[model samples]
Target: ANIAVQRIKREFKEVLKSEETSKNQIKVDLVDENFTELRGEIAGPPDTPYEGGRYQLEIKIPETYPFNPPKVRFITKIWHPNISSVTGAIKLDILRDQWAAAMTLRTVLLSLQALLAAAEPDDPQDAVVANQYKQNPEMFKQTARLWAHVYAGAPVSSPEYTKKIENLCAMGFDRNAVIVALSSKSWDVETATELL
Candidate 1:
């Protein structure tokens, strides 16, 4: 008997019956009958730039799961200090060295939602994003909102920022690179140009 498969089979129902699921805060769907691969979703916490957004996550349950944390990363794109904008890798303790065998899939999803509300810029997956988060918090918020709109199906964004990306992109630069340069440079066209 595979404990990893058996545990996931139980967790699948345990999560669905959870209060968090009742409130639509978190969810998971099986990717295969083996229950080793899953698709997770967390609603971005309210009042954050990521609010009104839904982020998809890829959760892989290794054979050593429950002892080792599941290999998790984003499927939906996000802009945050602790989440990689390009690679979708996450920098969070529970997913790493802080993991406890007692933690459940439901707990993992809830922690991710909490992470959206409070980012730890000091421990970053994207240092450029983290530097912006620490020094220019307001611009970071706007940029996050822009990303939420572009990549996460959010309904709000800034045209001023939009125009800036358009200006840089019209120069034949890669749109993604332009956004990254602009975001990392605090939306300064001059400084962004230096990076591009």
Candidate 2:
């Protein structure tokens, strides 16, 4: 178990050094206990419903180590077809099927970052979220991008989307919630009004 933790840390270091690592959003070490959990922040990948957002994940290795995949969950709130709003549960292949004995924490974290870039609506972690993403991808993209800017230090460039978000938030919904709803609805104020 200790060796696995060390290996994960080494692999994680290598991944962060890559040019492909998220420039806007990425994983960073917050804790460094070998036997305990490895904590990091995964920035939401660009141009996705979960864009410009920074999500935290707690990755842990068990006695089985590489033989069994680490447990991962979103520490930050997010709205996605494959991530649960209530529990931050994720329906990702690395977390379940497709995981391999040789896979390292670096690969797993990198994959999670990519997941935020594009969700699989067909296999969802939250059906309602999934339905919304499928119904209005544009709205989801705008809201997610905005959230990424606010939470992940991404530049605030979507003025139109921000205006819509401001309008929705004025109605008293949590900013993130409004973003999620707007994203789910394709950021159509007129259509969103129908839901309200």
Candidate 3:
């Protein structure tokens, strides 16, 4: 077998045997029969805005193997400064230039959980999301909660915010755009209206 398949088989077994899997915190499963692709699932960390949610991720093992980082992208929509809701891109050090050969799937999954706990709004993948997170943390929380409820299966929902989005939709504005506008402007109806 090639190094990519060999390494993936080892990591696959390691992930399945990990405590995180037993605790339902994270899991990795084969996506293709050849071990070239995998699917990852991470439970949102407790007490964070992402709590009670599960995020899916896609992983592709490269031919270069452990010397290069695996390609990873969120399959679920998450509202976070470091995670893009539109494209599901992630801005993570380990996945970028900081990648190391020693890192395993377990560590990568744990790092994603930690990322949910502590977001770096200043160095962000989504500028509008970062601005909303930095300028208005409360609104950011509410927006995140709403997105979690809508996309990630979180239990919280804001009917008021839902109504606002509906109103904006009635005016022919895109609901997602309205959400971004309102979130960045701290839910000021006038400002969000103008922005729309």
Candidate 4:
């Protein structure tokens, strides 16, 4: 924990003063007395459906320090090809690929911000979201925007979709369950109802 804590402390200071932080693109916060527990947030990249959304991350630093990569997951629920909608697990290359000993919290959060901008649907963690991302790119954008609005406090949502959700709720299905069905089924009433 010693080296991990030391590096994390320095990393925080470095992230805090960076241009990204100054522009509110990235942020880090201590979650416990030990530097092993931290929270990070990255703003959604512009010109994408996720823009104006903020994704929070749960970062757990291992005592192994720079030798082993830290564990990271989304704290915010999102619909993306590489992120789990239910569990919030991420499938990012940096967390597993030939990771660099030179990596830091600043770089990690910045990379995650980049991830929101460009999704590699071909190599996906969620097959369903990936298929939507690949075959139905416009549908992917709407679903992503809806998730940003409902879960990430983004400014907008499709009122048409919201009304559909309410209509499904009238049938006595769970609100969140309704959202899941509709989102996964491309907002088809019959299919969502069948799934529900």
Candidate 5:
């Protein structure tokens, strides 16, 4: 059965007006009806590592409509497993397997916000980022800060990280790859390079 676009749109509009919804920094818009592509923006929640950061997101709905959840990806870069560093693509079961006909755009956005607060490193989209996230705490914070600055424009990269990126770029390692590797090894270039 074809679902009514008006109904879905109406529900989402209400989501935009809600205080709880706005508080989470979720923004949504329909980009193309023919392809069912949607554009959204989600900011990192306050007090978390992702705080003060803004992330662009793209959601693509299937022709089958609400029976399946929309495909969501980060348009801005961030480090995480479950989310591809190269592409900002995300992989999560709730957005896929748990999708239902009644789910709304707001639900999806909030879910993503929650995911950012707590990442699932075991099933990571970027192995290096996940490894670093788990193995090193200090490095993880710095990497997260760097990601927030680069993608969200919250601030500039730390001098230490800036120098690290330069060194990696000089050595011909892909910039992102180096960051992931460095993050995984707690910014220990010696250890990260050895693993690389």
Candidate 6:
């Protein structure tokens, strides 16, 4: 545990001085003095629906060091096939069975950034999202952009989608549930209403 602390401290220090930080692509901050927990941020890749959105992540280090993977999950809600809309569980090999002892925070952050740009629809954490991605790419992009705007502080939001969600909310449904229903149903108000 002590060694993990020392290593975490060193790794965090390196992260601060990293080029990724200079590029405004990735960031890591301490959640507490003990270094067991961290708050991470990654800028969404350009040209993607998530572009301009700043995503927040939570990371927890284990005492086992590099032998085991760090626990990483999204703190910001993102509409993506590989990331859970409700729980923020990320479907990635690096954070799971394929974890390597040589992996560092820098690589992990970079890989996460990459994941945002390139999602694997076949192997998905959110099946509905994946299905939407494969079945309706345009709707997926619109919904993802709306999610980015609402949750990640992106500059744009779709008025059409917002209206749909607002309509559902007017019926006394939960706003979050309405968003999920509308997104999953590809903005079809009838289908979304049925889902609600």
**TM per prediction:** 0.92, 0.71, 0.87, 0.94, 0.81, 0.94
Ranking by TM-score: 4, 6, 1, 3, 5, 2
lDDT of each: 0.87, 0.69, 0.85, 0.86, 0.76, 0.88
Report the Cα lDDT for residue 88, model 1.
91
lDDT for each residue of candidate 1 in 8-59, tens digit (9 for 90 to 100): 7778888888845468778888897777889998887899999988899999
Cα displacement (Å) at residue 14, model 6: 1.2
> Candidate 3: which stretches are off by over 4 Å?
19-22, 170-196
lDDT of 2 by residue, 33-54 (tens): 5545766687666556455456
Ranking by lDDT: 6, 1, 4, 3, 5, 2
Q: What is candidate 5's CA lDDT for residue 84?
A: 82
Please provide, for model 5 over 26-127, each residue's C-alpha lDDT reduced to its tens digit, 9 standing for 90 to 100: 877768765477788888877666788888888877666657667888888877667887788787877766777777777788888888888888877788
Give residue 134's error in model 5 in angstroms. Answer: 1.6
The stretch of ten residues in a row with the least summed lDDT in candidate 4 is 1-10
Off by over 4 Å in 1: 19-21
Q: Give the TM-score comparing model 5 with the true structure, all chains together.
A: 0.81
Q: Which portions of model 2 show Cα errors greater than 4 Å? A: 1-6, 16-25, 30-32, 49-53, 157-196
Candidate 3 lDDT tens digits, 1-196 = 4755677788888888885546768988777887778999999898887998988999887887687888889998888999987898899989888999878888899999999999999789988889889887887888898888877889888898888888888988877788767766677777899973
Of candidate 2, the 10-residue stretch with the lowest lDDT total is 19-28
Alpha carbon deviation, residue 47, candidate 3 (Å): 1.3
